[PDB]
Write a protein that binds this ligand. Structure first.
Ligand SMILES: CC(C)c1cnn2c(NCc3ccccc3-n3cccn3)nc(O[C@@H]3CCCNC3)nc12
Length: 272
């Protein structure tokens, strides 16, 4: 029922192809990989937010149809020819946080936030992807997960948002750990080792271990081109206590989003 146009990329997780719609000639992408599946599929079809990937139709052979996107935030970040102005970063952050807020309001965690999961269309609209039921990521992993927490919440997605913000500002991954232990070392060397005051109940985590006491590097020295409003946003996203860490609604109300300059409109966002 769909007209296969091109080959975008393949993997054991999903087989992605570029295709055209046979009802309204709209270019869409298809991910080819049941009563229990329909329960999750109809819930995903019921979701509707401009900054969240839309599930238009499905196919028995597990085939899912979503809107077509040009690139993701990873392609943009790696493009040396592209220049990310403060207004460009603010636009990507506003869209990411607006999409995350919708998911959290509907009790859905992304669980895998990273640049290649924030996709962009021809009109400069960011949409989150890869969050519906499981049928490199260590760099964006929150410290509670690295200490083996089995029960977790919104802080897991919020920490990853801070890592994406830091990657837009530095143009390289913020904390590129070589292992789960090195990831915790990089977090503590950079942000400081948390105390029982900063993170109460840290010692009760399943894989809790005592690290060397690091003072940390002041956020203003790390992000030398950031203003005080942006430094406050970064500080809230990287609080050690998962309960104290800023939520998507709290982040959207920060003075950063209401201050000048404003976000770059979609049509003016850089395209590769
Ligand atoms: C998430 C859904 C299934 C979707 C929608 N659109 N879409 C594209 N669009 C093309 C694209 C996006 C991001 C980066 C590169 C491309 N691209 C490939 C060729 C030309 N542009 N690629 C992939 O998935 C692909 C293949 C699997 C890895 N991610 C990109 N998945 C999709």
């Amino acid at each position: 029922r769909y007209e296969k146009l091109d080959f975008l990329g393949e993997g054991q997780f999903a087989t992605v192809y570029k295709a055209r719609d046979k009802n309204t000639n709209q270019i869409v992408a298809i991910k080819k990989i049941n009563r229990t599946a329909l329960r999750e599929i109809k819930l995903l079809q019921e979701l509707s937010h401009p900054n969240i990937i839309g599930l238009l139709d499905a196919f028995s052979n597990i085939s899912l149809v979503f809107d077509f996107m040009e690139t993701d935030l990873e392609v943009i970040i790696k493009d040396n020819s592209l220049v990310l102005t403060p207004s460009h970063i603010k636009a990507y952050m506003l869209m990411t946080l607006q999409g995350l807020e919708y998911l959290h309001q509907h009790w859905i965690l992304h669980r895998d936030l990273k640049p290649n999961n924030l996709l962009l269309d021809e009109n400069g609209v960011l949409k989150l992807a890869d969050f519906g039921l499981a049928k490199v990521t260590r760099w964006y992993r929150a410290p509670e997960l690295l200490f083996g927490a089995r029960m977790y919440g919104v802080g897991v997605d919020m920490w990853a948002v801070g890592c994406i913000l830091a990657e837009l500002l530095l143009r390289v991954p913020f904390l590129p750990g070589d292992s789960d232990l090195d990831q915790l070392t990089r977090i503590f060397e950079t942000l400081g080792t948390p105390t029982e005051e900063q993170w109460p109940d840290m010692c009760s985590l399943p894989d809790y271990v005592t690290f060397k006491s690091f003072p940390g590097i002041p956020l203003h020295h790390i992000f030398s081109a950031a203003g005080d409003d942006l430094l406050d946003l970064i500080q809230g996203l990287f609080l050690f206590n998962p309960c104290a860490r800023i939520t998507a609604t709290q982040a959207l109300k920060m003075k950063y989003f209401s201050n000048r300059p404003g976000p770059t409109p979609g049509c003016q966002l850089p395209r590769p």
